[model samples]
Target: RQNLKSTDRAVQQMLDKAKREGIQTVWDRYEAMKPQCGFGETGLCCRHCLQGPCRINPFGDEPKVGICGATAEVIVARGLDRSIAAGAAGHSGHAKHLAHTLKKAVQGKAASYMIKDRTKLHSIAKRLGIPTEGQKDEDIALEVAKAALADFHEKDTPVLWVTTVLPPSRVKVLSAHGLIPAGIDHEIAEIMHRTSMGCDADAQNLLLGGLRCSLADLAGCYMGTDLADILFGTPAPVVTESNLGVLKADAVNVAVHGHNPVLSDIIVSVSKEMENEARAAGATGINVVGICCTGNEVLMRHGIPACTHSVSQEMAMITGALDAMILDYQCIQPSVATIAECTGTTVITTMEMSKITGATHVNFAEEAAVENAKQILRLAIDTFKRRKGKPVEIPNIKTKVVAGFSTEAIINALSKLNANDPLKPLIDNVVNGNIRGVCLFAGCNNVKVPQDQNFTTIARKLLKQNVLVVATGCGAGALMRHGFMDPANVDELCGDGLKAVLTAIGEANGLGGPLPPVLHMGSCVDNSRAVALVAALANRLGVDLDRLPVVASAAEAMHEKAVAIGTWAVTIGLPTHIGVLPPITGSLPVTQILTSSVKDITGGYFIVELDPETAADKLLAAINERRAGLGLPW
Candidate 1:
């Protein structure tokens, strides 16, 4: 079973059952696709055009160019640029959807939505140069929504959201190189056009186009986080639990899986009203658990227990306790329907565009969000009744998690220690070597590696070296499920220096216990929060982000979005690491551009390392290099 113990006991138990029942999972499929295509892996194959699916022989035994006269360098660079474009489109489209909803809510057209956090709304409005002077909250929110949407449409200027949110120094670097995006959609469309059959043959130029699109991705992610905060209230510290163990044997378990909070939040709100309905149907009540980033959304805002992350999402239903699995958009596997059939669980697709062929379609629109949520819960209740005689087994493995560490919550916690200068204490520790540096762990899980192994090992290594670790997306889920998010683990995992700093901060914040070694920084989109914190630190030190002793790592990245995020991290001047080798290795010129030469251009570059221990050493070395540059003791 390839060491079932590689994952948590909860997942191990479910995998055992799946084996017994002969039900295939992601691991099984991964094994079936053994020794995946070499041409595709090395980025030597090009299928961008219908003229030919060409392959460039790395051994020089065959043609060096494609049917359209594209060399390995051009082909690889174009492939990567298209990936970045698609990734940017996904995130930017999400931002557009939320902004549209906010616009409708402000206009009083959406009956089920309203501005939940007026303070955040006004703050964003002020940042966008929209005056809130004697203006109603709805009126200001309308303007803010328009400003956000304009970034997707405006053609003559760079994305306003990007120009407004990024530091001026960082913007100057991007602009000087022509890497500034004219608009989110414009850059993405340009990449699609440029990557076509015979366009943009220069590898360097194609890579630069990728860099621009990645920055647009950053703008999209920032806008998504800002508007989501305004609509859902910025998260504060909240105690919760995580793992498949959160499922209840006697309750109606409904798993919320996806990236968006729009439908998930409404489902959470309506779950309370239908608790009695679920009880009346002979179940204890509706037990709503979260999966993936949607899980992070509710976990951050309402303290909902997160059931599973990206790769192990199917494991959540294998417990035989899930009544219904509600999916929104992104990261949802179509194979979930097969898993649902095996377990008698009902898989419900919510978004109009994200329907699984075999799953029940329940179109969820914000205009009738309340009724839609009720309908979803009722289906779950009915499914619960139908599965009364089904054999149910839930793993009793769970861990306590204290999530919701938004930028505001973090600053508020620090304010308790230094009321007048909250960041001073943190910076002082950094300078004194009590906190050597900070690393933000972000990205998803891939089936190729043992689940959570990289994140766990590298995090412990860094924490023991006195590096402050912050996590988001499935990376946070991996750590949280493994007891790393428990505040009590700080004493054991942290080095003496970091332990002392965390202890002092915890005591000052009235925690009465040490904070967790790794801070849980919400979902993938909330990575913007890490950017916000770094920008603040850079501002405090009167330096650009590149000079700060901070780095980021995506230890188990599996999605195009991860690529875009890593690229944006580099664009903003943070040395980013990706554990998985990206597909630009076919051409030495393209590989050199990403791994070495780009640092000369952007002050940040990719460190491609797969081994957790070696990656930790490289990250520590990078941190020390930055510290030496800043004239700080290392």
Candidate 2:
């Protein structure tokens, strides 16, 4: 456990227990599969064609190209395109799922869901160019859903979520480069078509196509945030707790993992109604905790505690206190089913698309969302009843959490300072350098690095330099676990200027203290919220987004979704950083272009820095460069 070097003591102790019980976790497996392939690591290997699974020499030795005559650059670009395309498909799938559920609910088809935030629905409806003045809520919602569905294919218009959500100038740049996705699925499919063997073999063109595909990813993420807010209610600041200790020993502890909120949010609602049933099962209550992006979703919206995230998900089951791990989809490691078998926990797979043979499958559907949620809950309670009075190791660890900082919630809080001109105060602060820069910490945990290490190391350095920090995904999970999200830590962690700004906001909101130093925006999909904030800042300051003192980092990035998010971040004209070395390094041309030359084109580029300390330095350097561009003091 200590060899794993996780930052969470709760996780540390649980892994210690897993080790003692002779159970293999992610780290154990990671070590077991040591000395990973260099060719694959460098993206030099290709399996795109049946003729031969090709490999190019990274050292310019023998086998300099694939058997299909694909160069190192071509193979790397194709691989990266596929990764980004897959990410777009996944994230957009999440958005599409929500779109269908919302549409069915409005039509009285899916009885378990309803419009929880009409304000957000109307807002998004108008944004999509739908007429709301003469339409009922149901009509408007239907139109918005239709528009969202319309955005998935090649159409007369580009994806409305991508075009409408970004600033006009940002959209114009994307349009100028022909990067505006004609449709989400279209672009993703195009990447597949272009990257196929004997297809678009040009490295730069493939890279350009990938950048366009990332726009689809961006659109999907935006629609995901917008649609989820409309259906489940926009998140606002909520006080909660986090870490493995959030699992109650006397309760039916169910850790909800994966990305979608459709079933997970319903489960949260149902758990409250089923409290007495849990008590009858000899448990205190059904304690629903979260892991991964789905956890981020419910955590922000419902104040559900985040039990664990990313690499540490299996550790939650290892707690032995967790009765059932309910999974939705995305970022759910396959090892959990086996780990659940080892532990006494029942791993329940809700989505048909994401199934584990060794586990229970509820085949969740939105038509009977509440009913399916109840069945899932019943499984948890029944499992708890049977597993009661067993020896368990609860880490007795957690920290207070202040989360749910959605874009709307942030604007609402800022309105407390100047109701008529909320952006003014924030812009003024940036202009005066009270907030030196804004850095969005995002992405997930990688078993390759010490869990949460990159995020905390970089963030602590950034915060002290008065770089205002916000986070999503497991990056937020990391910060929350380390007490970086604690409002009390603001005074200690932040530079005087940043602390002053946070204190002012907190006092204006009548909190009598500072806002949490690291604002938990939402799940990885909710990176859209961070972009919305930046767009408003750019619009308010009468500047393009590329010139703003804003940056993004996915320090512990691992998943393909992280690649898509990072690509969109880069293409959207902001300096995006990743601590993990990307596979693009296999090709000198692709690596050089994305990191350097692309900035001239999109005003955004990748900063691949593996060392957190130097990574923070690079980000701070980028911020100062932006500040200098804005004619502000560095």
lDDT of 1 at 54: 96
lDDT of 1 by residue, 393-432 (tens): 7888899999889988899888988998889999999989
TM-score of each: 0.99, 0.99
- Model 2 lDDT tens row, 1-634: 4745587788889888888899988888888888998889989999998977788878858789888788999999999999999999999999999999889999999878888999999888777778989789999999889888999998898889888888898888888888999999999999999999999989889999999999899999999999999999999999999998898889999888888999789999999999999999999999999998889899999899988888888888887888988888888888888887778788899887889879889988888888888998998898898886787888889999999999989999899999999988888888787999999999988989999989989999999999989999999999999998899898789999999999999999999999999999999989999999999988987888899999999999999999999999999999999999888778999999999999987999999999999999999999999999878889
